[PDB]
């Protein structure tokens, strides 16, 4: 039960950061432009079973676009991403959408305005209307604060499985093993731990 998901949008809108947050839980502060596409499997546990997304995280920068719309072939859903602090990225939403639906003529698509955590918002809520005539779902999201970060996948899973009451469910938690530390390298995890002890945790001013 796996579905191909293509993720598109201007460079710097947070596509790769968003996927990575869902893959590992991390928040990557650095901007390393995606080169062509990166494919990652992503599974969610639902009350209707596991659903697996094959996430094709494509490049937004033109000079790194690779196969461009060639990535969209046989996609079964998509996310279009823009940045609410960059008006130009919303103005390009119709261009990404055009190139996407010319290949994928009838798929569920979510429009996501990312980076709502930033105080100085530029793409006002009231001006975000492109989705209405195109039957896209829309969400404000923040990969940095996790605001609505699950809603694009929850909606897509509901449309793909065909069950509007589908919900995410807690994965079962197997008993963890009882392993004793290794005395052969016990004198070694003094080093790996010292390094970790003296490397400051990020974002110490956050509520958590």
């Amino acid at each position: 039960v796996q579905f191909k998901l293509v993720l598109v949008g201007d460079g710097g809108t947070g596509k790769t950061t968003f996927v990575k947050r869902h893959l590992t839980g991390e928040f990557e502060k650095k901007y390393v432009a995606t080169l062509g596409v990166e494919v990652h499997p992503l599974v969610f546990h639902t009350n209707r079973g596991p659903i697996k997304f094959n996430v094709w995280d494509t490049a937004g920068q033109e000079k790194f676009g690779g196969l461009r719309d060639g990535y969209y072939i046989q996609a079964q859903c998509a996310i279009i991403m823009f940045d609410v602090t960059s008006r130009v990225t919303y103005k390009n939403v119709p261009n990404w959408h055009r190139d996407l639906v010319r290949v994928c003529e009838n798929i569920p698509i979510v429009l996501c305005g990312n980076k709502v955590d930033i105080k100085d918002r530029k793409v006002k809520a009231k001006s975000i209307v492109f989705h209405r005539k195109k039957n896209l779902q829309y969400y404000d999201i923040s990969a940095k604060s996790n605001y609505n970060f699950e809603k694009p996948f929850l909606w897509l899973a509901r449309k793909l499985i065909g069950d509007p009451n589908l919900e995410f469910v807690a994965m079962p938690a197997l008993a963890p093993p009882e392993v004793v530390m290794d005395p052969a390298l016990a004198a070694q995890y003094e080093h790996d731990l010292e390094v970790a002890q003296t490397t400051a945790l990020p974002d110490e001013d956050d509520d958590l």
Partner: protein, 1011 residues
């Protein structure tokens, strides 16, 4: 493995190997997929890969391989077409056309290879953009003719026409020059009469749904631009509004077509076109009522069930009804025979408005706002919609979203974490419509709300949801009733809300009803101002909630307190009848008791609200005495902490002492924020010792960095010491930005401030410099910069070069210093430009470097200020007239700014600043073409006008930077650009035309004659 073999072009291309790489990429996974992806990208990017395109389309068995082959042709067609020899151009055309014909006539390929045919159609459209109609004026006739030979060809011709219409009318603005866009638009317009014939015939004929849907899909595009007569002077509206609404295969696209038809503004004087606009709406609503759903249907449930395409149809219906009615409902409001149609359409909207779908609700709510605003002004209209509006009052009251102020939520009634701004705008919109609806019938609104309330008391409809949505609605209509009706109304609501608190007495219960009462009372200040006895009770009750163990109620009580104070402050400074003292006196006297259980941030909000009250007292003597009374606790803690810090200056090692100091300063910041210029007496009380403390904590930070390393800046101890410095800077910045006595600022504050902050900033290591120093200095320069010329120089010397060195190695490090840096240079450039004139020539060059460095940022904060500094600098220099410094400025830097501006204009990485970049370039060019540079810009024959040299310089610059341009393109471009340097709009269009042309070969130089 050996997948890379296909990247070698010495031999012939192994098609089977290619297909394996493609399948490995699409159908594979893991490392093989990743490697195949890189290989395919390299293959696609090879400037000769297009020569392999036709043999991939001939001999390949993989449709994806052929897709990638067409992407290779597309790149060639859109960027390098006119560099091909003419024979290669006809070969590519003939091959693409033949492949399309071949795929259509094979009924099996036409069914299963839809993507590959769509991609080929698009590729053909790219050839049309280059070749049609000047080198192919029979394409449309042959396309029309060939539509009869086959049904598959006729259907695919509609796809091609759809894509052509999109490329010419919908997506040409950014992709073509003005001249070429106009050429293709006129070319389609000239041949549309024939296209419409084929389209209308197919629709009337009526083969099967496949060809009909494709024809309607193309019609949807045409409606964006075609003349009105093709829609109203034919029978096509009857077909759209009847025939094609019945079959669900064509209903979706037809509704989108009728929505586009609706949105035009009709010739508002012809009765026939009006009757036709009425008729297709009447037909459409009848087809919905009989074939889809009657007006009574439960659209909320249908949407929730989400069968088939129901959700998309209901969305499209909402768009159709709102679009048409906003434009044309007046056509239905006078003729009594149309009243049912009008109200039925609005009844469908009422039903659509009950769907659970935020974005769809916003679409309908937008329409309701349009309606009620019109009924608020237009004579004799609101009675038509009485029953509609009554139903709408219920819909909005029962679906109010949680306002910002309500900090309690269920997940178990707990406390908010985040700011729901997707919900902020929604609430504002719901409030706007509900306020209008209340004005339209205040009796009906009160009766709905009071009755709903009466059924909460009874527990007949009690629930979190029902009391909450009702309470928020009640709060949101504040101001719609007359003071007298509001009086009686609020009394009733409060009385009934109090009774409800006693009844639902759990801890979650009491927190829900407490938040609702706080919201309501906070929303009716006019009522509070007139009932002092009640106001006093409310405030005392909020003070009691400040000791609530429930953190949500407690936090909300502090916010409601300051929210009420902002509106009712005057009633806290005067002595009320029956009162022994102004209530501000009572608040201050018990402030330690009231705030004892509050977190520090909440204590500061309390103090800030007291500052709002105190600033209402205009007797200076009495105000200052209130100020010193309010600050009694922090000033005593301050006096203690500074006597114990001067003697043995080591007690600041104590983390508990550092926390105490920061909270004292934060309290001063809070009170200064609300009192502004009135804060000065309190600031004077601590100012000297506060700057001494600034110096002492600075020495501690430096000492810790030296003893522990840079990592010390991450420690809780050093972060707490820097908080002290940042808050001190914030306090001084806050006061100076509101100060009304600038003489005291200059003579008392500025000099000790600069002595305390500048050298410390300059002589700390980069990771220990506080970007708040820059922010503070920006406010100093902004407010008194004109009075401290030598202090501005001192600011530059201390922060300019060392900050520049922090931010001129990449675009990412020290992001806050970056932003504050250019805000500081900006204000200095516009208010104390003389400080840059005294700079040494080497430092003024760093200044120019710094400005151009800002240009190249993508961070909008830095980029915008960089472009503004450049423009203000040019103005500053122009204002000096013909003097040595201005003349040396142009000689040294004019062409640096022109070339740096051109670079960011053309590199495709700084699109967001186009407007400001164009403005800067137009200014620079206009300087030369107004002979406002009184010195030759060159080092070329003598007597040459600067205009001639600028054209030579720019032609050579563009020739070397864009060598694929012809000399004539560059010359035409510059000619148009220089002639237009007084007309920003046309100038910008010419720059946009240039940015198109540099992306292809063979651009027509006459395109620059468009204006």
């Amino acid at each position: 493995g050996s997948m890379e073999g296909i990247l070698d072009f010495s031999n012939d291309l192994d098609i089977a190997l290619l297909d394996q790489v493609v399948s490995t990429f699409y159908q594979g996974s893991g490392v093989q997929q990743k490697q195949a992806q890189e290989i395919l990208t390299k293959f696609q990017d090879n400037p000769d890969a297009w020569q392999k395109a036709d043999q991939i389309l001939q001999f390949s068995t993989n449709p994806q391989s052929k897709f990638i082959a067409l992407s290779i042709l597309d790149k060639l067609i859109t960027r390098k077409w006119k560099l091909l020899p003419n024979d290669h151009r006809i070969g590519i055309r003939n091959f693409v056309v033949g492949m399309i014909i071949s795929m259509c006539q094979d009924d099996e390929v036409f069914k299963t290879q839809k993507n590959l045919i769509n991609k080929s159609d698009l590729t053909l459209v790219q050839i049309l953009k280059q070749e049609w109609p000047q080198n192919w004026p029979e394409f449309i006739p042959e396309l029309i003719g060939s539509s009869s030979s086959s049904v598959n060809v006729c259907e695919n011709n509609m796809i091609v026409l759809k894509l052509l219409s999109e490329e010419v009318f919908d997506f040409s603005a950014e992709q073509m020059t003005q001249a070429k866009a106009l050429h293709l638009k006129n070319s389609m317009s000239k041949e549309f009469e024939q296209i419409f014939k084929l389209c209308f015939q197919v629709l009337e004929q009526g083969s099967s749904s496949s060809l009909i849907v494709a024809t309607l899909e193309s019609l949807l595009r045409y409606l964006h631009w075609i003349p009105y007569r093709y829609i109203y002077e034919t029978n096509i509206l009857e077909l759209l509004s009847t025939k094609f609404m019945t079959s669900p295969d064509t209903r979706a696209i037809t509704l989108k077509c009728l929505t586009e038809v609706s949105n035009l503004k009709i010739p508002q004087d012809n009765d026939l076109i009006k009757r036709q606009t009425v008729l297709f709406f009447q037909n459409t609503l009848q087809q919905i009522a009989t074939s889809v759903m009657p007006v009574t249907a439960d659209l909320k449930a249908t949407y929730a069930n989400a069968n088939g395409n129901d959700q998309s149809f209901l969305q499209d219906l909402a768009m159709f009804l709102t679009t048409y009615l906003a434009r044309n409902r007046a056509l239905l409001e006078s003729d009594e025979s149309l009243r049912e149609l009008l109200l039925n359409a609005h009844q469908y909207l009422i039903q659509l408005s009950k769907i659970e779908e935020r974005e769809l609700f916003k679409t309908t709510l937008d329409y309701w706002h349009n309606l009620v605003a019109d009924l608020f002004y237009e004579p004799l209209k609101k009675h038509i919609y009485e029953e509609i509006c009554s139903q709408l009052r219920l819909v909005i009251i029962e679906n109010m979203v949680r306002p910002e102020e309500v900090l309690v939520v269920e997940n178990e009634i707990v406390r908010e974490f985040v700011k729901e701004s997707d919900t902020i705008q929604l609430y504002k919109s719901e409030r706007e419509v509900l306020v209008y609806l209340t004005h339209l019938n205040v009796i009906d609104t009160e009766e709905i709300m009071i009755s709903k309330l009466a059924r909460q008391i009874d527990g007949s409809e009690w629930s979190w949801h029902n009391i909450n949505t009702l309470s928020w609605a009640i709060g949101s209509i504040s101001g719609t009733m007359s003071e007298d009706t509001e009086k009686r109304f609020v009394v009733t609501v409060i009385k009934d809300l109090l009774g409800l608190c006693e009844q639902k007495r759990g801890k979650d219960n009491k927190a829900v009803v407490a938040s609702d009462i706080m919201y309501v009372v906070g929303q009716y200040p006019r009522f509070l101002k007139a009932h002092w006895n009640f106001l006093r009770t409310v405030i005392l009750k909020l003070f009691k909630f400040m000791h609530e163990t429930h953190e949500g109620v407690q936090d909300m009580a502090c916010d409601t307190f300051i929210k009420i104070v902002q509106k009712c402050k005057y009633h806290f400074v005067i002595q009320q009848p029956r009162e022994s003292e102004p209530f501000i006196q009572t608040i201050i006297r018990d402030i330690q008791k009231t705030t004892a259980d509050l977190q520090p941030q909440q204590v500061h909000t309390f103090y800030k609200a007291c500052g709002i009250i105190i600033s209402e007292e205009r007797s200076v003597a009495e105000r200052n005495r209130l100020l010193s009374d309010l600050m009694q606790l922090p000033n005593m803690a301050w006096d203690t902490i500074v006597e114990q810090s001067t003697a043995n200056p080591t007690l600041l090692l104590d983390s508990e002492t550092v926390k105490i100091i920061a909270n004292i300063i934060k309290t001063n910041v809070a009170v200064c924020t609300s009192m502004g210029a009135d804060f000065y007496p309190q600031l004077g009380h601590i100012y000297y010792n506060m700057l001494q403390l600034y110096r002492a904590v600075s020495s501690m930070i430096s000492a810790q960095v030296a003893a522990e390393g840079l990592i010390a800046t991450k420690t809780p101890k050093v972060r707490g010491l820097r908080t002290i410095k940042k808050e001190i800077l914030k306090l001084v910045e806050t006061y100076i930005s509101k100060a009304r006595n600038l003489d005291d600022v200059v003579k008392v504050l500025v000099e000790p401030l600069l002595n305390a902050v500048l050298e410390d900033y300059m002589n700390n290591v980069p990771d220990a410099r506080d970007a708040e120093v820059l922010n503070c200095m920006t406010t100093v320069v902004e407010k008194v910069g004109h009075m401290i010329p030598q202090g501005v120089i001192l600011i530059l010397q201390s922060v300019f070069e060392c900050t520049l060195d922090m931010i001129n190695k990449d675009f990412t490090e020290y992001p806050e210093h970056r932003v504050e840096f250019y805000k500081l240079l900006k204000v200095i450039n516009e208010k104390s430009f003389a400080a840059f004139l005294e700079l040494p020539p080497a430092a003024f060059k760093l200044f120019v470097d710094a400005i151009c460095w800002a240009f190249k940022h993508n961070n909008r904060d830095v980029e915008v200020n960089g472009l503004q500094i450049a423009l203000d600098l040019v103005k500053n220099i122009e204002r000096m007239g013909n003097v040595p410094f201005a003349n040396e400025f142009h000689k040294n830097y004019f062409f640096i700014f022109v070339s740096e501006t051109f670079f960011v204009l053309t590199d495709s990485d700084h699109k967001s600043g186009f407007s400001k970049q164009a403005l800067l370039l137009m200014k620079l060019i206009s300087l030369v073409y107004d002979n406002k540079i009184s010195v030759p810009l060159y080092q070329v024959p003598q007597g040459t006008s600067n205009q001639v040299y600028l054209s030579q310089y720019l032609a050579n610059m563009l020739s070397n930077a864009f060598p694929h341009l012809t000399s004539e393109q560059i010359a035409s471009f510059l000619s148009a650009l220089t002639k237009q340097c007084k007309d920003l709009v046309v100038f910008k269009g010419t720059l946009r035309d240039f940015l198109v042309q540099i992306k292809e070969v063979g651009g027509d130089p006459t395109d620059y004659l468009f204006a």
